[PDB]
Structure 1
């Protein structure tokens, strides 16, 4: 319900889908979007094109609250991650900074099987 100049935008792209959520100087959401939000569904969400429209529709909404300079944090290896960053920069928003903070266990709890496959 506020309107901040500088903000933040998160990228989450799992091989199944890509979600982008725009926050503020603290990380408290302003709006978001992703594959399904756009109009796509199912497999056609992990798709890069999907990611594109998303990041756009994402910031496209952010405009309402007046967003301009916003860092960027990426999480994933999505078969459609770049388009997110791109579509962002190429928007009425200035990609004030791009960082990659994809979580990663320092070898902790056993993973599933589709992943444990590495041993």
Structure 2
């Protein structure tokens, strides 16, 4: 209930789950979806299938605010990233563009043991 149309679609994909946050032309989120948003509770959450149902929901919910034109901003490689992008490309929303914006440090903090053994 605002009417936006033109806006941004943020896809935050990770190997543990995918979450889509649709927002306005300058940041403030309108509606968000995720693996949890929809049924899927644990492992199933990550799956590229959910990455779809999530994108769609995000858009559907976003269609209510009267969305249309959207700019997709992917963040992080993970189980079903490209899938979210495709979902949006369908749905209804017109995908103006897509852009990898995943963050990478210029070597700042020591990662958890989990992600070490690099160099």
- Alignment TM-score, normalising by the size of structure 1: 0.96
Identify unmatched segments of 5+ residues in structure 1: none
| Secondary structure at 1:44 match in 2 | helix
* Distance in structure 2 (CA, Å) of the matches to 1:11 and 1:117: 28
* Distance in structure 2 (CA, Å) of the matches to 1:38 and 1:87: 15
* Distance in structure 1 (CA, Å) of the matches to 2:63 and 2:117: 44
| Secondary structure at 2:37 match in 1 | helix
| Secondary structure at 1:55 match in 2 | helix
Q: Deviations over 1:19-67 (max 9, x none)?
A: 0000001110100001010110111011000101000010011000011
Deviation at 1:15, TM superposition (A): 0.5
* Distance in structure 1 (CA, Å) of the matches to 2:82 and 2:40: 18
Q: Which runs of 4+ in 1 moved over 4 A?
A: none
Aligned pair count? 119
* Distance in structure 2 (CA, Å) of the matches to 1:108 and 1:32: 30
Which structure has the highest helix share of the two?
2
| Secondary structure at 1:90 match in 2 | helix
* Distance in structure 2 (CA, Å) of the matches to 1:98 and 1:7: 12
Identify unmatched segments of 5+ residues in structure 2: none
